[PDB]
Amino acid sequence: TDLPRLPFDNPDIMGIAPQMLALQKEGPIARVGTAGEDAWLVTRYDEVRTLLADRRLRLSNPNPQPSAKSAARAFSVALMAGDDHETEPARHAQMRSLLIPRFSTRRLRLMKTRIEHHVDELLDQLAASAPPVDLHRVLSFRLPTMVVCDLLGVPLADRERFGQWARGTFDQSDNEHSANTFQQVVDYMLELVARKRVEPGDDILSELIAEKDGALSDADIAHLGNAVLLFGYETTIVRIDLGTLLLLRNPVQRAQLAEDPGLAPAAVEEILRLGVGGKGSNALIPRYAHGDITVGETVIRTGDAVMLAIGAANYDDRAFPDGGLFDLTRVRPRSHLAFGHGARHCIGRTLARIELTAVFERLFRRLPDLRLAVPEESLRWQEHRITGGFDEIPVTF
Template identity: 90%
Template structure:
């Protein structure tokens, strides 16, 4: 299934979405700026932007986007397995219905393309499964990184000021946001892999075929690769050498899209709202430990 999605997320195709994504960001920042402080940046910007983008990709009608995003989020909730399973089934049912609609009225979206190009080779259930994968893995981590990026820049006022004055540094800021967590949050991701050969790590021998869980957060703060690794540094050399998107043949196929979204946010946010600050003490922000991807449910700010 992965090979069917890879071409849909090519660098060229994702860059064609850049202008539309920037328009989304501008509209959301208008709404944020028009609010009366404190405003919840999470619900006004971080959550809606990736939801809108993934819905653009799948051709989800505008009227369905709010519930679509909430369904997807509920799927990652580990606090209630039955609720998570029920929510996932709602996503599956909706996607199955959407594929059937796209077969009758195709649009400019991934589902319609798969129907046209793979007609007969893939069942509607197969195409719906691909749509589920795009939804469930295509937006939640970006939501988390927008929130964490805001916190990282608020914690580093000199770097924040430098970014506000030099928006061309946004790509460098994005790489640091991807690399770092905040107080242990967002830096504890594990990715499953199988050993291709025997290897000794410390006193442990990992045999060919053994399953391993790799702590990419630890790699991303390895001082041998990143001098002063705990610092947020817009001038860091080789900033893309982190492993936030994995590595090799199983790297994240949505990495180009995520970078475009994050860059659009952080080249604008602090120029538009130079006095942005948290409206509550940082320690009062609640990290959602029960959610597979972690993240916050609110980020109150004033400006």
């Protein structure tokens, strides 16, 4: 008897930690220690999907004496209107009601066109440079920050100002740096709101300013803008890096995709499903039970913390035959859980798929000899950041 402790070691740079796959094999739910509170760890696809749809399991903490949290985690919960369990139902319903129409079919069709041209231009610059090149800096980072600049209606050069702010805000290792970075986000967004009140354009803050005859306050509008800025590029950057690493690991699938770019949608779904980095702490969706819930033979009690392992669930052989294998030819694959599920299902997931599809439609056709210029083991996943990620990806081509 040895209580398992998160985070689990992973000897590889990607995939699921062996200890978590071991727990998965034993059963759907296990009590584990963490750096803070003990929690229930749920690792099988069916149970994770069921619990993500269970409205008794919520982001907000119901407990009278809540355990202490890093500044980074406190910011992420507040951005999601999860910081007050008594007001979360109304505030989170309004949050989703105000953001979902900012990603209409009209907007997404226009953005798809611009995204496709931008990837062509980014890859032309890459192809014309001398290796070794940092693919993370010149491709993975540039496309999703371009998109956020477009959503917010600001010049592209603004991303050189805000491009590290998601990482800084979400640095769980340094509360002072996290708080000081978030204040920069706030000041920037409040400036932007003031500008859009007199100079609106076809962008998100302009739309919120006009919403319900201007009933929203500037603080409310800026809060929603902060969520778009801080959730809207960093995780996409990380999926471009992981997608590239996975395709480089699987030359037969890479060659299938280079030959037929019509396989890119299917490849993007496999990338999201298999794309887990390092110890994979960002592939856990955290919750608290607001009422008792039975999982298998286990009672989760009101107030218990629960870690929903969407990463492990996406590797579950029960839901994906040969769950550890990258396979472009899967017939009717189950919907993976990389965007979550249920009440907090990722609001940007259709836009994120458009970005990833546009990249992997083109990447290995435009750079057929692309490959890492360093050993994989030299690539360092950044465990202290809520969003993880690699800091550089050196390639040759």
